[PDB]
């Protein structure tokens with residue numbers, strides 16, 4: 001069981017986005033038998049937002065995972081799942097360094113593995 005979560009390399013400049021803009025990339029893997037994964041936002045990120053130091057909250061979205069009220073999830077039994085979190089076109093993105101904190105969970109439902117994730121994306 002390993003997890004990789006990091007900010008993307010594309011530069012974001014403040015203002016009103018025209019397009020879906022990549023912000024973080026996630027990799028969740030385990031050779032063990034499993035049903036799927038949760039990605040649960042934690043702390044300030046509750047609600048599924050990245051949050052800057054001045055308290056600006058920006059929505060995260062992904063096309064690789066589903067969403068259930070307050071968390072991403074997917075049924076995927078393969079050894080490895082990748083996801084990109086992006087900012088939707090049309091959102092205004094203001095000042096600073098935006099942190100997302102979360103907890104990744106592997107389930108079979110019973111959770112059999114869990115790990116904190118954290119990364120900071122610059123605007």
Ligand SMILES: OC[C@H]1O[C@@H](O)[C@H](O)[C@@H](O)[C@H]1O
Pocket residue numbers: 037038068073074075107109
């Ligand atoms: O099948 C199990 C899955 O069911 C979904 O409805 C739920 O949002 C996921 O977190 C996971 O528990």
